[PDB]
Amino acid sequence: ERPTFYRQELNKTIWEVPERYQNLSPVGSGAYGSVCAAFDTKTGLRVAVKKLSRPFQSIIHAKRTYRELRLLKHMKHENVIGLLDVFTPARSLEEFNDVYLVTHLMGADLNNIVKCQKLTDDHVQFLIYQILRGLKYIHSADIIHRDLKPSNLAVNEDCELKILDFGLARHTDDEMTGYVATRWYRAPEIMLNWMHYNQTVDIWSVGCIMAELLTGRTLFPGTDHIDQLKLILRLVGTPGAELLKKISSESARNYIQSLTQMPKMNFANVFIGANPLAVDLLEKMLVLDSDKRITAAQALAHAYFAQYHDPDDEPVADPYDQSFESRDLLIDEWKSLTYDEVISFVPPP
Numbered sequence: 001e002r003p004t005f006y007r008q009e010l011n012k013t014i015w016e017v018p019e020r021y022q023n024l025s026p027v028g029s030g031a032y033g034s035v036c037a038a039f040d041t042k043t044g045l046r047v048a049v050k051k052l053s054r055p056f057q058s059i060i061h062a063k064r065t066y067r068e069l070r071l072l073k074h075m076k077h078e079n080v081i082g083l084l085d086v087f088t089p090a091r092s093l094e095e096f097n098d099v100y101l102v103t104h105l106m107g108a109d110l111n112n113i114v115k116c117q118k119l120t121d122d123h124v125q126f127l128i129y130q131i132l133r134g135l136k137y138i139h140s141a142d143i144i145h146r147d148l149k150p151s152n153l154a155v156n157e158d159c160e161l162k163i164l165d166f167g168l169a170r171h172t173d174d175e176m177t178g179y180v181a182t183r184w185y186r187a188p189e190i191m192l193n194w195m196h197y198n199q200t201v202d203i204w205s206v207g208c209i210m211a212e213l214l215t216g217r218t219l220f221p222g223t224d225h226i227d228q229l230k231l232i233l234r235l236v237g238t239p240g241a242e243l244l245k246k247i248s249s250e251s252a253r254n255y256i257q258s259l260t261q262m263p264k265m266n267f268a269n270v271f272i273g274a275n276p277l278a279v280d281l282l283e284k285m286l287v288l289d290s291d292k293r294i295t296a297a298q299a300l301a302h303a304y305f306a307q308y309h310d311p312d313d314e315p316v317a318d319p320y321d322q323s324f325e326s327r328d329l330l331i332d333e334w335k336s337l338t339y340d341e342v343i344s345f346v347p348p349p
């Protein structure tokens with residue numbers, strides 16, 4: 001009933017996996033783990049296998065491990081990554097120190113698309129439609145992605161798209177510094193820690209992604225946090241008093257008021273030649289005040305997606321209990337919770 005596992009070393013990491021998974025090759029690595037492509041001989045699928053790096057080394061790691069397993073086990077939607085398998089070579093809780101996660105392999109991400117391909121407005125409609133369909137689902141579970149960007153969007157040959165998070169890195173201060181794509185898609189309220197944020201950050205990211213699909217260029221390629229803010233405020237205008245009072249960070253508020261006031265620009269003169277409906281949708285996503293941004297559910301009903309929108313096939317998630325988020329436990333308690341979730345996993349039929 002327990003499969004047989006075999007061992008191999010790949011780039012200084014030992015991988016111990018069931019025999020069903022063959023031809024493992026390294027695909028990515030970071031502080032939190034490593035990923036290989038493989039062939040699943042049981043299902044005939046090409047898969048990605050993520051080996052978490054010392055998942056129970058600390059409370060933050062143990063909870064992160066638990067969190068990712070909880071999320072992936074819940075995600076059951078065409079446009080969101082799902083869990084094919086989860087395994088450990090451990091035969092008991094006492095032996096349990098490693099966690100491996102298995103999903104559908106994707107190679108191509110949206111960067112591959114935007115920089116190689118010439119996307120028509122039809123392609124842009126279909127790609128952004130699928131992001132929004134996925135996001136409606138994710139948000140319906142009160143899950144916030146927070147790191148939407150082209151490298152976290154997998155896209156196949158038929159332009160079919162899935163949202164994931166390939167994050168093997170700590171978004172450290174250094175990682176968010178300078179002329180870096182790690183920060184270019186972030187809502188300004190989270191980039192600058194303006195206030196307590198919510199799921200609306202993800203819609204800002206979608207606006208940035210949609211713009212870049214339309215133009216082939218990064219929307220806000222800031223050289224640093226402040227330069228990026230300036231690029232943002234140039235396009236969308238400086239904040240009015242109503243938004244300024246919502247910036248609960250007094251230092252951040254005081255800074256943004258130092259800036260000379262600027263009006264929102266004409267997006268038709270920015271996105272020259274774009275479908276007017278794309279321009280209208282961008283205007284509704286790229287609103288500084290996150291309270292006033294369009295939601296994923298609202299966006300799906302926008303005329304730009306008339307060709308794709310089916311209100312009977314834009315499903316919501318089952319209830320997702322994230323009461324664990326506010327719970328403090330010891331490493332071994334997070335570990336046993338995680339082990340229970342590994343043990344209870346039922347594969348997709």
Ligand SMILES: CC(C)(C)c1c/c(=N\C(=O)Nc2cccc(Cl)c2Cl)n(-c2cccc(CC(N)=O)c2)[nH]1
Pocket residue numbers: 035048049050064065067068071072075080081101102103143144145163164165166167
């Ligand atoms: C889209 C959604 C549901 C918010 C998501 C997918 C995901 N994990 C992956 O997408 N994992 C993954 C990616 C590429 C290949 C493979 Cl094998 C995996 Cl398991 N997520 C995810 C990734 C790393 C950590 C955490 C937990 C945390 N945020 O602290 C979650 N989050």
